[PDB]
Amino acid sequence: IRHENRMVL
Amino acid sequence: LHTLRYISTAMTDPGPGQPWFVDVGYVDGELFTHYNSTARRAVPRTEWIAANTDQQYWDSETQTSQRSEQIDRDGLGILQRRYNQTGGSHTVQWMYGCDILEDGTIRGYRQYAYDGRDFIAFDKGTMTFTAAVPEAVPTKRKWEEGDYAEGLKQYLEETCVEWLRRYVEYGKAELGRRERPEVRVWGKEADGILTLSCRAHGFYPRPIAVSWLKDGAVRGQDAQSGGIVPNGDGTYHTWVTIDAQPGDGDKYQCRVEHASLPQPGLYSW
Amino acid sequence: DLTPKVQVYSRFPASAGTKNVLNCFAAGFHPPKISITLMKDGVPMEGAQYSDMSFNDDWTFQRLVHADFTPSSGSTYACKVEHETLKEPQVYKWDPEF
């Protein structure tokens, strides 16, 4: 499954 | 031995009618899922993933992709400003996933590129983010103060691997198959030179060795290869050429070594 | 920016009158916007399918275009590529090898 993350540049 | 890779592209200039955000996933190099900013749904791309997942699986994948889309939508503006750029054509790419190697060790990675050049990558072993350029230092600093490394390590070492092992079982019949190539040797003479080509059509899996032999002995002088390129159906293609003297065609053989051939194949023009 | 490296080839070793698939594979390019058109006798071929935008380990972009076709002698087939690294469309001819 895809990684649900909240890493914003 | 086995790989799970997810990638995405975010574009300021995809072209007319084309989606600006495209995300695709691969198991053992085979495309098995897709999402873009136009259809806005994550979908299966093999029969073996479709047969072994349910609607909740795809609703969850879609939710994840829509979150990735909104983050990268803003990322395009963020990095244009980071680089003091005005508009123009720019891209943000990332790739992440996990590898199961043959001895049983696991690797995991997550890396980014801006305008096609390395920007930042996870260093899982030190739980830090490696800036490739000065412009990535503000990103590194934010992700390291924010303790994102914890969840990323957990995804790469646990979630990614656990699902990769399932995907390989779901697709065992397709991923583990062997398809024998159809091989053609052809010749063309021009400018006093005979160029011999050998093309292997439709082999699976991807690794292959195609060589030219002259009077039985291997020859690489003035030989060229187009590498391995894909067919529409998940099989592969490759061509190799060699330059010979006109009239010397009978002395050459093409040799094909492939998992589908218990004995290597020899072919004449 | 990187110019596309293009190969044109059929799914099966071709013979006149035998159903086949014509492939055009462009790789190694940047930016990702690209036009790739399969042609028969100077006219765009019907039935073409385009892979969704993807890229290799080195971040360079690639796309496969393919269309079902039945090769005919005395027809010519090609792949026409437009990219901003190119000053004019580049036409790559298919060798039928028969």
Author numbering:
A (entry chain C): 1 to 9
B (entry chain A): 2 to 270
C (entry chain B): 1 to 98
Task: Paste lines from the article.
In addition, peptides from avian influenza viruses were predicted and the influenza H5N1 virus M1 peptide IL9 (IRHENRMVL) was found to bind BF2*1901. The structure of chicken class I molecule BF2*1901 complexed with MDV peptide RY8 was determined to resolution of 2.0 Å with two molecules in one asymmetric unit, while the structure of BF2*1901 with influenza virus peptide IL9 was determined at 2.0 Å with one molecule in an asymmetric unit. The Cα atom superposition of BF2*1901/RY8 onto BF2*1901/IL9 generated a root mean square deviation (RMSD) of 0.533 Å. The superposition of these two structures showed that the most distinct portion of the two molecules is located in the middle of the α2 helix, covering residues Glu145 to Tyr149. For BF2*1901/IL9, the loop at the middle of α2 helix is closer to the C-terminus of the peptide, compared to the structure of BF2*1901/RY8. Furthermore, the relatively smaller F pocket of BF2*1901 can accommodate the peptide IL9 with PΩ-Leu, which is never found for BF2*1501. Meanwhile, a π-π interaction can be observed between P3-His of peptide IL9 and the residue Tyr156 of BF2*1901, which may partly compensate the weak binding of P3 side chain out of the BF2*1901 groove. Interestingly, in the two structures of BF2*1901 we determined here, the middle potion in the α2 helix of B19/IL9 shows a distinct conformation compared to the corresponding position of B19/RY8. The superposing of the two structures showed that the different secondary anchor residue of peptides RY8 and IL9 lead to the conformation shift of the α2 helices in the two structures. The large residue P7-Met of peptide IL9 pushes the Tyr149 out of the peptide binding groove, which is different for the residue P6-Thr of peptide RY8.
Compared to typical mammals which express multigene families of classical MHC class I molecules, in chickens only the BF2 molecule is well-expressed and is the major ligand for cytotoxic T lymphocytes, while the BF1 molecule acts as a ligand for natural killer (NK) cells and is relatively poorly expressed if at all. The overall structure of BF2*1901 retains the common characteristics of MHC class I molecules from other vertebrates including chickens: the extracellular region of the BF2*1901 heavy chain folds into three different domains; the α1 and α2 domains form a typical MHC I peptide binding groove (PBG), which contains two α-helices and eight β-strands; the RY8 or IL9 peptide lies along the PBG, as shown by well-determined electron density maps. Compared to BF2*1501, BF2*1901 has a much narrower and shallower groove. In particular, the large residues Trp95, Arg111 and Tyr113 from the β-strands on the bottom of PBG of BF2*1901 are replaced by the much smaller Leu95, Ser111 and Asp113 in BF2*1501.
